[PDB]
Amino acid sequence: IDADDYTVNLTSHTTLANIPSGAIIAVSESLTGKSVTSAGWVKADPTVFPEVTGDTGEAVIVYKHTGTASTSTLLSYHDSPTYQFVIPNGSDIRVIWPTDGFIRF
Amino acid sequence: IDADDYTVNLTSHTTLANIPSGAIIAVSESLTGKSVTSAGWVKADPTVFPEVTGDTGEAVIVYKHTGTASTSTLLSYHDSPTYQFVIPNGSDIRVIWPTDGFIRF
Amino acid sequence: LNPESTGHRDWIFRPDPAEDADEVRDPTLYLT
């Protein structure tokens, strides 16, 4: 996700249809190793976006893929104080999750 | 619930069978009328405990009900000190929620 | 010495984890 094309609002947005459709530098392939713990943490294996070209990108968003963009519910937004951006250049991009889980329920 | 039996843990107590059989001062029927706001606050209309005898438990618990102690699971615990001042008269005792919600998902 | 080393390298992006407070409110009992 490109953060100049998407000022995040954790309250008003609900579905993929709310994300300004040009902010999407790349689309996640489906998650794997999806697992849970008694603390309510979700975990998954790292995700690759292959051969990405586009503008500078600054955030990752997770949502329930359901084919129709109007019913695909958003479930998180992520950035970091130090992993602030990526410059796509034809390389792969790898999102490596924190090993102990990345969303709390 | 009677706190003199249930030492307050929800970090490893997880099913109804973990709540001591001696702790249930009162139990009440399924919550009549429920909704969840766009803000994720769960809401329900008031509930009553019938003909209650016994006293001085000082806490309240809510759980998903299956009819069986192994698969019914805990959703919240509450501890407001006004629970120190019910001393049941062999009486109806009534549970009034905050108007706007009591749990956020 | 190593042809494959002269290709692109993957960007590693590391999100901070998402969590929020256990926000909750207590029901009030009444005698009747």
Side-chain angles (χ1 to χ4, degrees):
Chain A
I1 293 289
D2 170 337
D4 289 349
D5 289 344
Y6 180 67
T7 181
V8 63
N9 188 311
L10 297 177
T11 296
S12 64
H13 304 161
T14 60
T15 63
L16 195 277
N18 302 130
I19 279 56
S21 61
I24 302 174
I25 272 52
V27 177
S28 314
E29 297 193 335
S30 186
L31 298 308
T32 190
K34 211 282 191 162
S35 294
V36 292
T37 76
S38 59
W41 283 99
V42 165
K43 317 203 304 287
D45 291 346
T47 298
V48 285
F49 304 96
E51 302 187 294
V52 184
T53 60
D55 295 335
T56 298
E58 306 94 344
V60 170
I61 290 179
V62 193
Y63 60 76
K64 189 175 65 177
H65 180 35
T66 63
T68 56
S70 59
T71 78
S72 296
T73 55
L74 301 178
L75 70 83
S76 71
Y77 160 96
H78 301 269
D79 59 35
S80 183
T82 191
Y83 293 81
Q84 297 184 354
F85 56 79
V86 170
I87 312 298
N89 62 4
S91 305
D92 301 342
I93 300 173
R94 193 183 302 264
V95 177
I96 302 184
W97 310 111
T99 55
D100 306 3
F102 72 97
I103 299 169
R104 190 79 190 280
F105 296 77
Chain B
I1 208 75
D2 190 352
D4 292 349
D5 208 344
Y6 174 77
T7 184
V8 184
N9 160 331
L10 208 96
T11 56
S12 67
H13 306 141
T14 61
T15 185
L16 191 282
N18 306 146
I19 295 181
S21 185
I24 50 161
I25 299 178
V27 178
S28 59
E29 302 305 331
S30 305
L31 297 306
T32 45
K34 186 195 179 79
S35 64
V36 187
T37 65
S38 60
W41 283 93
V42 185
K43 289 173 58 173
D45 298 343
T47 301
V48 190
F49 296 116
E51 302 190 317
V52 185
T53 57
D55 56 3
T56 68
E58 313 180 5
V60 172
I61 293 180
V62 179
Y63 40 73
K64 183 267 291 288
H65 192 203
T66 62
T68 56
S70 304
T71 61
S72 297
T73 57
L74 313 184
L75 301 181
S76 70
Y77 164 98
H78 299 286
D79 69 1
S80 179
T82 60
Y83 305 151
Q84 302 172 2
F85 299 88
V86 288
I87 295 96
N89 294 311
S91 176
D92 45 293
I93 317 291
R94 65 192 307 111
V95 190
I96 278 66
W97 310 101
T99 53
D100 303 3
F102 58 103
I103 292 163
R104 194 182 82 69
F105 296 145
Chain C
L1 292 179
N2 188 308
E4 301 189 333
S5 75
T6 73
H8 289 287
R9 52 75 54 72
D10 44 356
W11 289 88
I12 288 173
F13 180 87
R14 298 191 187 254
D16 292 23
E19 64 181 328
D20 195 10
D22 190 23
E23 64 188 320
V24 70
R25 309 181 192 186
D26 286 13
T28 52
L29 304 182
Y30 292 84
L31 302 180
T32 53

